[PDB]
Design a protein around this ligand. Structure first.
Ligand code: T1Q
Length: 267
């Protein structure tokens, strides 16, 4: 029943992801897999029970648009194992290899993202770091959303290249819990902006703290006049709706889904 994967089963391979909170390897285990090992040297049993609780969050998820959690591992290191996605992430596609998606496709990606997000919310999961980086185009047609689970193992364990997707109320760390359904909607808004402009927001300000400061005071927002010539007027409008500075004015995904599923059947 439980998803622990005993020592010696998994075969870690080439190295792909970097940084602190976990190093990511393309393993093998009943086929190709991705393995994310939290390089927290060796822990301290009341961390181990917090790592388990986060796996209770993951297994909550079963949807074609959400990355598939296949099972975790504690033995050699702490690590989570998910399916492997052949093909690159939206961020890579959009900003690195400058892929040219057809508009029909861009909308669909936007749609799947929202679909998956809609699901994540119904299950009471707030992603908290949605961005083009954490959206994977598997086989290049199916969107898999990843990197949404663990959170609790970060705020209690010992936010930069992800400020462009931070809603204002998140940028200005105002209180205890700035993160919300709505904050995600805004993050989804920027990836809407990414899909539709092929650009990251504020590509013309080289000081990053001002970006932080301004977006936090509502002096700065995505320039919605860059939605490429053929982007539907309803999109450029739904975009602005997702990017509302006051979070209470933002739509929730079941409704964001409807606005996309409709502007699709009209093109
Ligand atoms: C169920 C949620 C579990 S999570 O802990 O929230 N997320 C989570 C956990 C473990 C992983 F291995 C991954 C993960 C899977 C993955 C699959 N395919 C690719 N292809 C290449 C990508 C090019 O950038 N990259 C991946 N990267 C970069 C990952 O980080 C993950 F996203």
């Amino acid at each position: 029943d439980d998803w622990e994967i005993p020592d010696g089963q998994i075969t870690v391979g080439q190295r792909i992801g970097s940084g602190s909170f976990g190093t990511v390897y393309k393993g093998k285990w009943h086929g190709d897999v991705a393995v994310k090992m939290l390089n927290v040297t060796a822990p301290t049993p009341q961390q181990l029970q917090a790592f388990k609780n986060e796996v209770g969050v993951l297994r909550k998820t079963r949807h074609v648009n959400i990355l598939l959690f296949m099972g975790y591992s504690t033995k050699p290191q702490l690590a989570i194992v998910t399916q492997w996605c052949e093909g690159s992430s939206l961020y890579h596609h959009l900003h690195i290899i400058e892929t040219k998606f057809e508009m029909i496709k861009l909308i669909d990606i936007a749609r799947q993202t929202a679909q998956g997000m809609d699901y994540l919310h119904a299950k009471s999961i707030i992603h908290r770091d949605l961005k083009s980086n954490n959206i994977f185009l598997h086989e290049d047609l199916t969107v898999k959303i990843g990197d949404f689970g663990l959170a609790t193992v970060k705020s209690r364990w010992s936010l930069s290249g992800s400020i462009l997707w931070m809603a204002p109320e998140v940028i200005r760390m105002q209180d205890k819990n700035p993160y919300s359904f709505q904050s995600d909607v805004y993050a989804f808004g920027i990836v809407l902006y990414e899909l539709m402009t092929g650009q990251l927001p504020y590509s013309n300000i080289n000081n990053r703290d001002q970006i932080i400061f301004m977006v936090g005071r509502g002096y700065l927002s995505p320039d919605l006049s860059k939605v490429r010539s053929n982007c539907p007027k309803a999109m450029k409008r739904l975009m602005a709706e997702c990017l509302k500075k006051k979070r209470d004015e933002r739509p929730l995904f079941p409704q964001i889904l409807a606005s996309i599923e409709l502007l699709a059947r009209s093109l």
